[PDB]
């Protein structure tokens, strides 16, 4: 169960440090644009 949380944490940390951030950069452009 501890191993299964460790993979939950991991797989969704890498959704934050990729998929969230790069999208945020795009959307944060439109405010100034």
């Amino acid at each position: 169960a501890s191993n299964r949380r460790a993979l939950r944490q991991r797989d969704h940390s890498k959704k934050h440090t990729r998929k969230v951030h790069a999208q945020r950069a795009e959307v944060a452009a439109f405010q100034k644009k």
Binding site: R24, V27, A28, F30, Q31
Partner: protein, 173 residues
């Protein structure tokens, strides 16, 4: 990476203990920095293994916290923004106005989850003596034992995250 060990003693022969400890399972020592040992003592960081390092060692002569960071004890445990959680409460057996003002209170007051229970009192009181009195082995609200203790969450933090969240929502579109 491995184990930042803090406690004996003061007062230590930290260096002597570390030198002896080399040998497996353990390797890489040195006595450092704020308090009083780091030994690596691989590999999951903090570490899983370190539980053992409690009674193992002393001799000598107390001992032990370990951490990987942050690691003043003050932020995570002691205080922090004087957040509380109130437990048990139940969503269809309460109203938002009911538990709110009965516990000071609050604001901000957001019950979870449903599960059920574990409802942030984002509080003000500040929180010091409030825990001691509403935990109590009582007083019974609404019929359950009522256990109230500390967080270790919030305040302005969540508010800042709401601000960046708000501009992201308006921007997307």
């Amino acid at each position: 990476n491995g184990v930042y060990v803090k406690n004996w003693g003061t007062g230590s022969v930290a260096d002597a203990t570390n030198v002896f400890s080399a040998a497996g399972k353990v390797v890489k020592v040195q006595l450092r920095r704020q308090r009083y040992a780091l030994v690596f003592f691989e590999n999951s960081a903090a570490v899983k293994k370190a539980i053992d390092l409690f009674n193992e060692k002393e001799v000598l002569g107390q001992t032990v916290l370990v951490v990987p960071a942050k690691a003043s004890p003050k932020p995570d445990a002691h205080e922090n923004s004087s957040c509380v959680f109130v437990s048990p409460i139940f969503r269809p057996s309460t109203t938002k106005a009911q538990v709110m003002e009965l516990f000071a209170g609050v604001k901000v007051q957001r019950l979870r989850m449903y599960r059920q229970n574990f409802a942030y009192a984002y509080l003000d009181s500040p929180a010091a003596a409030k825990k001691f009195v509403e935990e109590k082995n009582g007083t019974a609200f609404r019929g359950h034992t009522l256990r109230v203790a500390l967080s270790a969450r919030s305040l302005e933090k969540l508010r800042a995250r709401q601000e960046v969240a708000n501009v992201v929502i308006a921007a997307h579109r």
